[PDB]
Structure 1
């Protein structure tokens, strides 16, 4: 019986909890990728490690909004990364691109729900903190995927090495 809860639909509360789990999952995927490239693509490793920290801040801010609006946080298992054993740095970038577009669709479904329930604070929260960061991340990974393919990856040995030094350096 929250004395602070106001105009916060239970469907929105449940969907925020599902988004929290998805952000944590994305953090887990990036942590997997980071530690995977320990041998020869160590700037890929630090790119994905930074991506991993960002995803956990994404989850923590949704956990904070759940408390702010008077909801109840409900956590679930953080599934281990679906994609794994990437044969190259390019394949990891492709999976991250796929991941971020899946997360973007989740955020767009969240916004549509907030719109349907007439929750302008929740729509503003999604737009201010997550919608443009998603567009930027998808654009960045799209740039990386396309550039690496043009450079000659994944066949070329120098392509991923040089991309590691110059683009992710």
Structure 2
């Protein structure tokens, strides 16, 4: 038992570790998307920059979660970061939809973790997840939905010119 541990259950520690691993997996998937849009036959630099920024944001998420785990007295247990389920993300709209699904899964996991923290009578972790992630994930999901809608309203993926214009005007 750590000297700084106070009102911190072991289930919350396991959930924090699992969310750390989930954020690592999300950053891995975002990096995979970024360097898939870096290929010569794809040639979409703005999508690559955006997905690299998203991977860095998920890295910051994981770092903040590990710092919070070290603060609450819990111990960190890292696991194997699984590779993305895909290596060729087809087009831009497919990558945006996959990122939207990943963000929704991360949001569901964060909501389950906050429900657990509320059941554990842990207001600190509750408000931490509320102010540091919930609104962030909501904004990210809204932005990805807007991007998917704009890509569908232009002819993608059937129109590569539409994806080029979305790379230039929107993500540029």
Which runs of 5 or more residues in structure 2 are unaligned? none
Cα distance, 1:41 vs. partner? 1.0
Q: How far apart in 2 are the matches of 1:109 and 1:3?
A: 28
Cα distance, 1:83 vs. partner? 3.3
Q: Is the 8 A contact 1:83 1:95 kept in 2?
A: no
Which runs of 5 or more residues in structure 1 are unaligned? none
Q: Is the 8 A contact 1:153 1:159 kept in 2?
A: yes
Q: How far apart in 2 are the matches of 1:154 and 1:89?
A: 7
Which 4+ stretches in 1 moved above 3 angstroms? Answer: none
Cα distance, 1:21 vs. partner? 0.1
Cα distance, 1:157 vs. partner? 1.9
Measured against aligned partners, the alpha-carbon deviations of 1:32-83 in whole angstroms (never above 9, x if no partner) come to 0000018421100000000000000000000000000000000000000123
SS at match of 2:117: helix
SS at match of 2:73: coil
SS at match of 1:12: helix
RMSD of equivalent CA atoms: 0.9
Q: How far apart in 2 are the matches of 1:142 and 1:162?
A: 18
Q: How far apart in 2 are the matches of 1:46 and 1:21?
A: 23
Q: How far apart in 2 are the matches of 1:80 and 1:16?
A: 20
Q: State the TM-score, normalizing by the size of structure 1.
A: 0.98
SS at match of 1:151: coil
Q: Is the 8 A contact 1:40 1:161 kept in 2?
A: no
Q: Is the 8 A contact 1:33 1:45 kept in 2?
A: yes
Q: How far apart in 1 are the matches of 2:78 and 2:146?
A: 34
Greater CA drift, 83-92 or 54-63: 83-92
Cα distance, 1:133 vs. partner? 0.4
Number of aligned residue pairs: give it. 169
Q: State the TM-score, normalizing by the size of structure 2.
A: 0.96
Counterpart of 1:39 in structure 2 is 42
Counterpart of 1:14 in structure 2 is 14
